[PDB]
């Protein structure tokens, strides 16, 4: 009795909708494409969705391929167009979907379930607030399909939306009910519970840390459960808890015994545990014992599955990748200390005949290279040739993995004679780069890139064959590997530097890049790598690139102009104008950057008669850090190129860099900092006024923990130059910045930047000598960094530095505290 309610449609649209569904099930394809569009077009009503769900709930006298299809098209009508949703009509969807879930038919259960989940995750958890309490009340079990359906709905809801739940904070009452179903008889319910709870563990919410003590104790009881899903969610829970928590004695045996499970998915869910463990500092003194059982298991998984060989695409994270990664982080934890565990296996598999295993062996060699590098060197002189000859294999996977794994020992290959190792590697590598198989081209290129990156100037004599084969591949490649070809040539010019500047090498390399240059338009995204490629090439061709400087420079300035214009338009009126892709600015600037770094003063004629400085001053204020990074880099290159044109704009530049000194934008800060450096050595004494704005930030930056060494080096050079030109304003900070300055300035070459930096510090010390005394050790340390100093600089060190030593009794007790080689190098050199 009491009170009730319901909804009733009419015989109007039900017949037409039923004909549209019965014909929307037609075996023809044109009928599906027609009727499905007509139904996605008959949504202009507020009542239509109540028609569909009326077919789902009350139309109990109709075949299920029609009912479930109606509910599914309702799913798409809510998930798709939900802004024009009638609220009162959707109420019927809420009540009917909520109360008709325990239907005995599994199909209706599944479609209603996905209706509830899509209504929740697409309709948010706010507008409908009586859903979760009624689901949790319906969760107290009855028959079977009821609590299982509402439970699964809570699984997909808790899998999608999770943070938002942290309804009077209801999760406190959720966990015990899960625990009530945590010791359930049916395995599926439990597998739903574990996966339900596994979402709120990495988020380390405040509701679980109270009900966790017995939670995990109970979690261990599901160790011997048979349903692969239960093992999946449980092992998942342990892997996730390994990151935010520190029974380790038997869990290692359960996991290692479970790593060889019959299901590769579950074995993966248990395989991430080794990554999460090897990341934490606990793995050092807990994992070491039972390893000889672990290593072969990993190698047992590192072979390609029977499934994956046929799809060659592959997935993106498998037991293969997870095993290789686990072996990676473990090798990085142990360094040379894992040779015994593996070496017999390598000696075996590396010379097998069934290649499916040999591939695994070569991959394992690639997996321990970075980790166990120092202990692997002695075995190498025989290892590489077997890989060299392995490059001549006929099967593709072994050839490619030979390219990459062979590429991983680029240092030892290039740190030995060339005609012995580097020449044959380059030869065969180039011969397999021109392959009929795609992955061999891409992986062989991405191996050549590393080979040049570690080889550098050793590639000068062979540039004819290198460029010949690489441009043969240029005209012979496709598109997805062409990006990596641009990578290879860019890394080339970056590696072999100026020695590229020969007219016939230009005749090999430049005609195709000019063809690709001419055929492409400005709105084509493929210009992103090309310019970048040319950028590095513009660094190497130097003055030989003069005949083509005008058009390239012009096109870059134009691109910048257009992009900035569009930016302004989107800034003034979003609803009418378009927003641009600012990736066009950076790359352009990069080229311009590189252009200066290739031509120097030869760019003069171009920089004056082109309103480009103003464009830079407009770029340096944008929102994305990338354009400030690249724009400041260009500012440095232009400052060292020509300063007769930049001088006035300097007045409006230094304040910008005054606010662009921020470590949160590392990629920018360095460049910004570097700019000031190249400014000071050009501004001379004129650099005087702008000091108090940049200096007090720079010194605070140079004494920071967890700071990249490149930023401390460019900051060091900047402070040095600011001191060389403005010693009276920079000098008093010596007690405050002298420590990490020379502490970090030990890992540099000897040219001009370090020279002007040490001139600056020498003038600043001659002007304020009181600052460095208590830390003078460090200074002497830095003085041990010079191998070829100039005459005047040498005099600067030996004369005054001699003054400190001449004022002879205490410099022994104070001197014999740092190593002898530097001691007698300073004592004999200065």
């Amino acid at each position: 009795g009491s009170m009730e309610y319901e909804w009733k449609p009419d015989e109007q649209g039900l017949q037409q909708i039923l004909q549209l569904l019965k014909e929307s099930q037609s075996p023809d394809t044109t009928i599906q494409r027609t009727v499905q569009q007509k139904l996605e077009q008959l949504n202009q009503y507020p009542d239509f969705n109540n028609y569909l769900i009326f077919v789902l709930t009350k139309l109990k006298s109709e075949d299920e391929p029609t009912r479930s299809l109606s509910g599914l098209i309702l799913k798409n009508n809510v998930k798709a167009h939900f802004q024009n949703f009638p609220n009162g009509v959707t109420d019927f969807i809420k009540s009917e979907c909520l109360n008709n879930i325990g239907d005995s038919s599994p199909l209706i259960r599944a479609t209603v379930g996905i209706l509830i989940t899509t209504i929740a995750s697409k309709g948010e958890l706010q507008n409908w607030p009586d859903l979760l309490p009624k689901l949790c009340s319906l969760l107290d079990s009855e028959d079977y399909n009821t609590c299982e359906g509402a439970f699964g709905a809570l699984q997909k809801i808790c899998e999608d939306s999770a943070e938002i739940l942290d309804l009077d904070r209801p999760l406190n009452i959720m966990i015990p009910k899960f625990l009530q179903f945590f010791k359930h008889s049916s395995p599926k319910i439990r597998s739903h519970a574990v996966a339900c709870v596994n979402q709120f563990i990495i988020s380390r919410t405040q509701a679980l840390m109270l009900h966790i003590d017995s939670f995990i104790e109970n979690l261990f009881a599901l160790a011997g459960d048979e349903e692969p899903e239960v093992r999946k969610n449980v092992c998942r829970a342990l892997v996730m808890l390994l990151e935010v928590r520190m029974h380790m004695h038997n869990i290692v045996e359960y996991m290692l015994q479970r790593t060889q499970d019959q299901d590769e998915n579950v074995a993966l869910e248990a395989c991430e545990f080794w990554l999460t463990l090897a990341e934490q500092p606990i793995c050092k003194d807990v994992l070491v014992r039972h390893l000889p059982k672990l290593i072969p298991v990993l190698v047992n998984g590192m072979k390609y599955s029977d499934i994956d060989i046929i799809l060659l695409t592959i997935s993106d994270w498998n037991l293969r990748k997870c095993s290789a990664a686990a072996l990676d982080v473990l090798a990085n934890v142990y360094r040379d200390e894992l040779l015994p565990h593996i070496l017999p296996l390598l000696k075996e598999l590396l010379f097998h005949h069934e290649w499916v295993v040999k591939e695994s062996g070569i991959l394992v060699l690639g997996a321990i290279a970075e980790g166990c590098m120092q202990g692997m060197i002695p075995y190498l002189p025989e290892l590489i040739p077997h890989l060299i000859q392995c490059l001549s294999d006929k099967k593709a996977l072994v050839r490619s993995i030979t390219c990459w794994t062979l590429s991983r020992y680029a240092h030892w290959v290039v740190s030995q004679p060339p005609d012995t190792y580097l020449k044959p590697l380059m030869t065969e590598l180039l011969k397999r780069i021109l392959d009929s198989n795609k992955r061999v081209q891409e992986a062989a290129c991405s191996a050549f890139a590393t080979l040049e990156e570690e080889a550098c100037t050793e590639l000068v004599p062979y540039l004819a064959y290198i460029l010949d084969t690489l441009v043969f591949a240029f005209s012979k490649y496709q598109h997805k590997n062409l990006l990596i070809l641009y990578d290879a040539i860019g890394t080339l010019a970056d590696s072999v530097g100026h020695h590229l500047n020969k007219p016939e090498y230009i005749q090999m390399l430049m005609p195709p890049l000019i063809q690709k240059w001419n055929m492409l338009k400005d709105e084509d995204k493929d210009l992103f790598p090309l310019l970048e490629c040319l950028s590095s090439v513009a660094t190497a061709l130097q003055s030989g690139f003069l005949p083509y400087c005008e058009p390239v420079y012009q096109r870059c300035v134009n691109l910048v102009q257009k992009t900035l214009a569009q930016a302004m338009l989107n800034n003034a009126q979003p609803d009418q104008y378009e927003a641009p892709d600012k990736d066009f600015m950076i790359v352009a600037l990069d080229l311009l950057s590189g252009l200066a770094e290739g031509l120097g003063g030869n760019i003069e004629q171009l920089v004056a008669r082109s309103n480009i400085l103003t464009l830079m001053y407009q770029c340096m204020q944008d929102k994305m850090p990338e354009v400030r990074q690249s724009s400041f880099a260009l500012l440095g290159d232009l400052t060292k190129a020509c300063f007769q044109h930049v001088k006035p704009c300097i007045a409006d530049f230094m304040p910008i860099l005054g606010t662009n000194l921020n470590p949160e934008f590392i990629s920018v800060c360095n460049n910004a900092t570097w700019a000031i450096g190249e400014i000071s050595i050009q501004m001379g004494i004129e650099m005087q006024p702008y000091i108090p704005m940049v200096l007090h930030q720079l010194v605070e930056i140079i004494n920071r923990p967890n700071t990249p060494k490149t930023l401390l080096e460019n900051t060091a050079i900047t402070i040095g130059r600011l001191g060389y030109v403005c010693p009276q304003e920079v000098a008093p900070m010596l007690q405050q910045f002298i420590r990490p300055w020379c502490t970090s300035l030990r890992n540099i070459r000897d040219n001009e930047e370090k020279d002007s930096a040490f001139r600056g510090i020498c003038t600043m010390i001659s002007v304020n000598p009181s600052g460095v005394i208590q830390d003078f050790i460090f200074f002497c340390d830095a003085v041990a960094s010079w191998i070829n100093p100039k005459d005047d600089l040498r005099d600067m060190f030996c004369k005054i530095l001699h003054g400190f030593k001449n004022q002879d009794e205490n410099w022994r007790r104070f001197s014999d505290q740092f190593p002898l080689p530097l001691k007698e190098r300073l004592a004999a050199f200065y």
């Binding site: 293969r320 990748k321 290789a324 990664a325 072996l327 990676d328 991959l363 690639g366 997996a367 290279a369 993995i401 990459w404 991983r408 891409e442 992986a443 991405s446 191996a447 890139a449 590393t450 990156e453 990006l483 990596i484 990578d487 860019g490 890394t491 970056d494 970048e532 950028s535 590095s536 950076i586 990069d590 950057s593 990338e626 990074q629 690249s630 880099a633 590392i666 990629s667 360095n670 460049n671 570097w674 990249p708 490149t710």
Partner: peptide, 18 residues
């Protein structure tokens, strides 16, 4: 010089499984 997303990009997109 420049903490280049160029050099870091072309370094990252070098293909490998390990």
């Amino acid at each position: 010089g420049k903490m280049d997303s160029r050099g870091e990009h072309r370094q990252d997109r070098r293909e490998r499984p390990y």
